[PDB]
Symmetry: D2
Subunit: 292 residues, 4 copies
């Protein structure tokens, strides 16, 4: 009998290919079903029954086919303040259905608010100190109301729950801040400001299972340090543990490091070792599927 | 030197009175500041600094005074789909500020979506079975789309994140379901349906710290059973543990029990033993404040 | 190369056979080394290096083959209050070497004192109550001194750390108790006494990974109940979790159940599903080796 | 009535004095009973009942006073490979009785084998690396057999479970090692060897609740660093958390640090802040008693 694995990722990565031939316990097979959040819906019952639905809008003359995932691999963000970018209810649905996931549905749900994720890093930074965990000094505003100034400009204003260079605005002076603050008013949501950094380079320390990779972009893969490993291990324990994650830090010309954030299972696969990470992810997923 | 405790509760319960005279370690005092979510705002910095602001709109000619809580006691819900009922960003803010809380800010944040909370109960029901944990068979719909019927009517449709008999609608037949489903469309959010229950009575098993109380409403305080205690202990471990919580179950005339939900630190204090529970809550809060 | 798995079990079970062909990630091979605690020895260094030297003196004087386990499966018992029965320092050694194990080395070490294990069950019985967890009312005596009388006869005296019918003695009266008490003096160790159960039949609820089996003896497999499953799940969480375990309970002639103990990874495989359980254990071990 | 706290410590510290006037919840009183492991005895029953009988033979033959601790504070060491040094069965007894403790009875029991405790530090050193956690490179020998040579001289041989300068021996050459190895044979127990550190000074980073203190000896208090704090926080999480602990490290003449061990609730109070730490311990104990 087989095992269905739903991979929530943009069409771009042919997951069925990578899971080709992998057998759970060396004998059971894995049917790989893949779709984006937008093309999915579901009904979950507390007694156990459920049904996920595929293709709200896509090729195969739409139609919409339901399946029953035994496991889910979420490679896509669940929240985005941009129109239609609200799949949080789908995550809740999957959790309600009791479907095992990577990363855990719990973490995926708690990753829906960036400052909520950053708040975890704040706790770790509090415990560890700047010498161990140089977390940029960000400021969180529940809403633009007391959003009045910035101790040092330029400052980087990150609005709502954004990603992909979006929601980011670099402010250079007081008068320009007040305008962006008024724009934050119209967004009817929270924002954060952080000192802008004159960066010599930036790093991203990733961890997939027990695998660590450090890349430097200015994309040169550099070597891991106990310091780097501390950053990522620390962050990998949040929301009960993150199977796939990375910590982005900026190394300023001044030689000071500043950790800006931690990303979950949606972490974009970068570098030369593309397929390599995809294989690691496959091994991890197959193994968790075997433990169900 | 003293300790400020912010209690987020409606003006109705004079908390300052109950904390009167209680001293941390038998010597430090507790200044009790109390406000509703609506009258509060804050700025939190990753370096540690922060400022909470009181009275967005209230007596004392408003003005707005800031304080610095050393601890928070959240006795109010953080989310409500009704207008202005969105303080989730305040919770995030408090967490960002690193302020200890009861219940934990983590739990308070995860309690913002009822079906997300119910999903935890589903896991426990899955593990334990109906003989140990008779959780009503609820159905979750991410959105009204496949919301087509109900195996048995009447059915109780609970819309969005509601509370206080609001968002609840008892549906008696198919045609009436389809209308409510169309109304769920306009709410642009999720809903749940569950078999309606012909109840002989209902129970609420509460747990405050190590104190358990069982009440029956039809408000008679009844005795605790190992069965009741199992229900509440089980639920008290979710989202990393809930210091104050209760499990509501309906006992149908048919002698079958059905657990409908678990409530957090906002759990309304009921019964005769009103002040009593308030004292227990005070002892718990003072003790957690001492461990900081 | 391949992956070495050391299985600490009597030679009476050919583990290499069961692991035959099983490949980690469907590719890496598993070399199965098997020996008995008595034939094992090692050295572990904090920098990481180590060696587990198997000394099987099977003809040819001192026969020693060095090996380096990647994982351990402990199916034999580590501590026994008898000659040639203390292999606790080997467990410590393996932990010191950092070798992954099933069950965990932590649990295997904490299972070295039966009443210490029973003490965990006492905590669970205190939380759950007799209705949920009917743990026999045993009495622990750190030594013979306080061992003056029993409040029930017959009584079953269990001396120190004994197993497989050893160290157990049923006393029928006061005079006979005082004699056994003087014998406990001579053991220079602790003892426990418990009411004797004139039992119709005894049950053993086992759990290997996510598999549950209930057997009755008077062997005959019976069906699992939520009650049975509660017993074993509860016990499976002790010492940080037990991958393989079982709960033994006696259903007296009184018509009620009595939990007498919980056994770890050394739990004897019984019934007709011996080989099936052996496979379940194999699948579990291979999977944990894959996560290492 | 009041609340009984049994403090297991040598009479050289008048605990009743420090707990004088301290009231649980500002109301309930604390009766402080204090004795030494040797003078203690008990009986514990699974149904809940128990008794801890203090036999202080201070003039007047057999002097016994029964008592029932509500909490225990273990400041004395439980296991010692010497005559009159095994009180492990008392710890088990207390756990069996369900009495709350500081440190936890679980940790006190797992601290009975130094290399078992060291094994935890080895795991942390493996995760963190020498840069973050410079744990001396110790070697564990389950027994004298494999104890053929050391890769560095001088070397420090620590026999079995010894403390307070006991069982430690510095060997300067091969011939002298073989003699000490033959002596380890006679102990019929395990031993460890570690490179000898010609040290300028040794540090001890302590943590009592949320208080950190660093002392240097050549005693002199020095300031805490994020590095120091990392060492102690890391160690404070072992065996489920240690309320009172310290990490001893030697800063050699080589110019680098070496962590040699972590001590539990029996950690000797040193420095000039002995009384301050005694108060910190008192505040911690009273608070945990309040949560019970
Ligand atoms: N505080 C800062 N100071 C200076 N440069 C910054 C700062 N924060 C971000 N940047 C740069 O802006 C890029 C994108 O902003 P991010 O905070 O990473 O948000 P994002 O929307 O996740 O963007 P991507 O997908 O990572 S490029 C980073 O990769 C940095 O090079
Ligand atoms: N499935 C059901 N079948 C029958 N009666 C129900 C059902 N669910 C709820 N009720 C009743 O409706 C009341 C309120 O609905 P709840 O689910 O408790 O929502 P709520 O908005 O939290 O309401 P309160 O504050 O507890 S009255 C309960 O106290 C029950 O008496
Ligand atoms: N209090 C008791 N009353 C009656 N029968 C008992 C009692 N304790 C043990 N027995 C029986 O004796 C068997 C063995 O004693 P246990 O306490 O289970 O330890 P053991 O001798 O190590 O067990 P095994 O199964 O032989 S390895 C049980 O399986 C019971 O059938
Ligand atoms: N490898 C070593 N090299 C050099 N000095 C050492 C070494 N091990 C221990 N020492 C010293 O010996 C002291 C005591 O040995 P420990 O391993 O700490 O055990 P101990 O004898 O129980 O300790 P205390 O503090 O006397 S209770 C340390 O505090 C060091 O100063
Ligand atoms: Ca980013
Ligand atoms: Ca309710
Ligand atoms: Ca047995
Ligand atoms: Ca020491």
């Amino acid at each position: 009998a087989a095992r269905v694995l739903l991979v929530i990722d943009e069409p771009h990565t042919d997951w069925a290919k990578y899971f080709k031939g992998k057998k759970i316990h060396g004998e059971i097979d894995i049917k790989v079903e893949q779709a984006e959040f937008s093309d999915l819906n579901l009904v979950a019952h507390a007694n156990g029954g459920f049904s996920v639905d595929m293709e709200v809008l896509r090729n195969g003359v739409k139609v919409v086919r339901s399946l029953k995932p035994d496991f889910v691999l979420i490679r896509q963000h669940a929240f985005s303040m941009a129109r239609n970018g609200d799949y949080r209810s789908l995550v809740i649905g999957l959790q309600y259905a009791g479907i095992p996931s990577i990363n855990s549905l719990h973490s995926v749900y708690n990753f829906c608010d960036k400052p909520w994720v950053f708040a975890q890093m704040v706790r770790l930074h509090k415990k560890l100190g700047t010498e161990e965990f140089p977390l940029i000094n960000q400021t969180f505003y529940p809403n633009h109301k007391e959003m009045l100034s910035s101790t040092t400009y330029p400052v980087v204003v990150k609005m709502g729950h954004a990603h992909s260079g979006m929601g980011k605005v670099k402010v250079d002076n007081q008068h320009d801040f007040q305008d962006i603050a008024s724009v934050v008013a119209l967004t009817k949501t929270y924002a954060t400001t952080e000192p802008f950094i004159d960066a010599k380079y930036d790093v991203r320390i990733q961890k997939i299972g027990q695998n660590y990779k450090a890349y430097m972009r200015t994309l040169e893969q550099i070597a891991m340090s106990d310091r780097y490993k501390l950053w990522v291990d620390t962050c990998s324990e949040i929301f009960g543990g993150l199977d796939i994650c990375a910590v982005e830090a900026l190394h300023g010309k001044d030689g000071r490091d500043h950790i800006i954030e931690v990303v979950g299972s949606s972490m974009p696969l970068i570098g030369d070792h593309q397929d390599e990470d995809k294989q690691l992810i496959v091994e991890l997923v197959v193994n968790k599927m075997a433990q169900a």
